Each structure stands twice: as C-alpha cells, then as structure tokens.
Write a protein that binds this DNA or RNA. Structure first.
Lengths: 88, 83
DNA sequence: CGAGTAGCACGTGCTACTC
DNA sequence: CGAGTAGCACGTGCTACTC
C-alpha cells in the first residue's frame, strides 16, 4: 500500500542523504592539515579540528595584516631617509 | 537496563556533535547569524578554508616583496651619507 | 487543502578499543 | 560469551514548510 511505498521512499532518500553528508565530511577533513593521515577521524573530531584550524587561519591573517602595515610604514621611512641623505 | 543507558549515551554523543556543528558554523563569516543545514555548514567551511589559505598566501606574497624592497633600501641608506 | 519533502532526532545492534 | 562505551549507519520517528 501507499504507506509501505512511503516508508521505502523515506529509507532510500535518508540513506542517500547520509551518504552525501559523509562525502561532505570527508571533503572537509581533507582540508585540515592536522588530519593528513587520519581518514578515519570520527565526525566530531573533524568538526572540532576544522574549527580549530579556521580560527588559526583568521588569527594568522590578523598577524599578516599587522606585519604588512609595519613593513609599509618602514619602507616609506627608508625612502624618507634616502631623501635626507642626498646622493654622493 | 543497559538498553536505556546505551540510548542515553548515544543521545549525548549526538548532542556533542550538534554543539560542534554550532561552533563550526560560528567560525565561518558567511554562516554567522544565518540558517544552514549540516551539509551546507560542512561545504561552506570547506570552501572558506581553501579561500583563506589562498588569501593568506597572497598576504605573505605581498609581505616578502616588501621584505625584498626594505632590504635593498637598507643597502642604499648604508652606502650613502656624507661621502 | 493535506500529503510530500527536508533535515535532524532517536533506538538499536554490532565492532573495536581500553581497562 | 567480561564490562563499559565511543562511533557508526540503518530504519524509522518527527514536523515545519511547501505546493
């Protein structure tokens, strides 16, 4: 009957959904350095480590932006010095 | 007996995964304060990590250039003055 | 309209690890 | 069959939202 067809549809669609979710987990795991040789890392470890890794990349950007800003001000300073010294 | 216990431990385990998804969601700018399925969260996290690694790489690339520039200027300032 | 779908929760049984 | 339990994946439950 229809109820049985619906039951079967539910089982097959949910099974496929699980499969796709596992695909997404593996794809994310592959982007985390720390999980390089840990293809069996459980779902929760992939989550926690993806999170840790993302936070490190953002902080890592804040540091790089601070450094570039410093190097730039440094450059203009060096040029300012050259102008004061004049040629030989 | 051990049946109801096992069921509680499994619910707790899933709950931890739920919390972890929420913490991941909070880490990706595009998902912050938004609604997304778990599949979207994993997928967006993945794209954001690739994007960020190519963004910082470009940052370092600009930094090393400035590095080469300042080093040369330092050379000039050295070999210059009241000759 | 009220049945179909999406997407997460649950119960459960089996493996492997650890004591 | 040792006991406890993390992790997994299946079938099924649950329901807000849709057409």
């Amino acid at each position: 009957g229809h109820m049985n067809v619906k039951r079967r549809t539910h089982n097959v669609l949910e099974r496929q959904r699980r499969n796709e979710l596992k695909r997404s987990f593996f794809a994310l795991r592959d982007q985390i350095p720390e999980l390089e040789n840990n293809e069996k890392a459980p779902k929760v470890v992939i989550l926690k480590k993806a999170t840790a890794y993302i936070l490190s990349v953002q902080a890592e950007e804040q540091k790089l932006i601070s450094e570039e800003d410093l190097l730039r001000k440094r450059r203009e300073q060096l040029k300012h010095k050259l102008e004061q010294l004049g040629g030989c | 007996d051990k049946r109801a216990h096992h069921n509680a431990l499994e619910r707790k385990r899933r709950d931890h995964i739920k919390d972890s998804f929420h913490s991941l969601r909070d880490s990706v700018p595009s998902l912050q304060g938004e609604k997304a399925s778990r599949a979207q969260i994993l997928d967006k996290a993945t794209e954001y990590i690739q994007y960020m690694r190519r963004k910082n790489h470009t940052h370092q690339q600009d930094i090393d250039d400035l590095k080469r520039q300042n080093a040369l200027l330092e050379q000039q300032v050295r070999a210059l003055g009241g000759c």
